[PDB]
Write an enzyme that holds these catalytic residues in place. Structure first.
Site, PDB file in Angstrom:
ATOM      1  N   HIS A  36     -21.913  49.573 -93.985  1.00 22.26           N
ATOM      2  CA  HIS A  36     -21.544  48.592 -93.129  1.00 22.26           C
ATOM      3  C   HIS A  36     -20.477  49.042 -92.085  1.00 22.26           C
ATOM      4  O   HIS A  36     -20.447  48.666 -90.875  1.00 22.26           O
ATOM      5  CB  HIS A  36     -20.740  47.553 -94.246  1.00 22.26           C
ATOM      6  CG  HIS A  36     -21.859  46.871 -94.797  1.00 22.26           C
ATOM      7  ND1 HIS A  36     -21.808  46.471 -96.272  1.00 22.26           N
ATOM      8  CD2 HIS A  36     -23.002  46.415 -94.566  1.00 22.26           C
ATOM      9  CE1 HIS A  36     -22.805  45.806 -96.770  1.00 22.26           C
ATOM     10  NE2 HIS A  36     -23.743  46.019 -95.594  1.00 22.26           N
ATOM     11  N   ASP A  60     -30.180  51.181 -99.689  1.00 22.04           N
ATOM     12  CA  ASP A  60     -29.980  52.509-100.533  1.00 22.04           C
ATOM     13  C   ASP A  60     -28.423  52.706-100.775  1.00 22.04           C
ATOM     14  O   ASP A  60     -28.024  52.165-101.730  1.00 22.04           O
ATOM     15  CB  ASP A  60     -30.431  53.406 -99.042  1.00 22.04           C
ATOM     16  CG  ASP A  60     -31.825  53.956 -99.824  1.00 22.04           C
ATOM     17  OD1 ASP A  60     -32.400  54.344-100.486  1.00 22.04           O
ATOM     18  OD2 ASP A  60     -32.587  54.099 -98.432  1.00 22.04           O
ATOM     19  N   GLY A 116     -14.489  43.065 -97.670  1.00 19.16           N
ATOM     20  CA  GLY A 116     -13.580  44.189 -97.650  1.00 19.16           C
ATOM     21  C   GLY A 116     -13.652  45.083 -98.806  1.00 19.16           C
ATOM     22  O   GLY A 116     -13.148  46.125 -98.971  1.00 19.16           O
ATOM     23  N   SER A 118     -16.209  45.644-100.637  1.00 16.06           N
ATOM     24  CA  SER A 118     -17.629  46.158-100.861  1.00 16.06           C
ATOM     25  C   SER A 118     -17.626  47.398-101.386  1.00 16.06           C
ATOM     26  O   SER A 118     -16.821  48.478-100.974  1.00 16.06           O
ATOM     27  CB  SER A 118     -18.267  46.150 -99.391  1.00 16.06           C
ATOM     28  OG  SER A 118     -17.408  47.087 -98.660  1.00 16.06           O
TER      29      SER A 118
END
Ligand SMILES: [Zn+2]
Length: 165
Positions: A36, A60, A116, A118
């Site tokens: 991201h 993935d 944030g 993640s």
């Protein structure tokens, strides 16, 4: 330059770019995270850039090698499904497995707070990695369920990224 003050020796590690810092878990000795906003150029480490090894945007994963005394977890194999979405700042929340690569939040939490963190490794009781926080099935600002990829699929992701030859 790029020498951010990181803090290995624990379980998760974050990164930083012109925007903010993401969250990443050292599973099997490889800090996993989503592409991201991890930066495509030479990432930064606590004392040197991080050599890129595994990175495949969505559908993935992205796991660089964590050798700075990073704690490597392992694949899940529990009997129940009560996990704890660990964020990158000493803040975990209980989750209830709802399906493959997904869990349920047991407390109204704002999704913005999830943004944030993640990469938050889901962990059933105390150890054994289950998967990371790829996204969070949330309602208007409030998060209700979790979008997580199991830490076992990450092993499959490496087959996609080789660059050996
Ligand atoms: Zn488990």
């Amino acid at each position: 330059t790029g020498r951010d003050k990181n803090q290995v020796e624990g379980e998760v590690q974050v990164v930083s770019t012109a925007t903010q810092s993401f969250l990443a878990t050292c599973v099997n000795g490889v800090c996993w995270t989503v592409y991201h906003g991890a930066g495509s150029k030479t990432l930064a480490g606590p004392k040197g850039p991080i050599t890129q090894m595994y990175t495949n945007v969505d559908q993935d994963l992205v796991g660089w090698q964590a050798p700075p005394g990073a704690r490597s977890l392992t694949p899940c194999t529990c009997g129940s499904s009560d996990l704890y979405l660990v964020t990158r700042h000493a803040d975990v929340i209980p989750v209830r497995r709802r399906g493959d690569s997904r869990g349920s939040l047991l407390s109204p939490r704002p999704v913005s707070y999830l943004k944030g963190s993640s990469g938050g490794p889901l962990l059933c009781p105390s150890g054994h990695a289950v998967g990371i926080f790829r996204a969070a099935v949330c309602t208007r600002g409030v998060a209700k369920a979790v979008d997580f990829v199991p830490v076992e699929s990450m092993e499959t992701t490496m087959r996609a990224s080789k660059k050996k030859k």
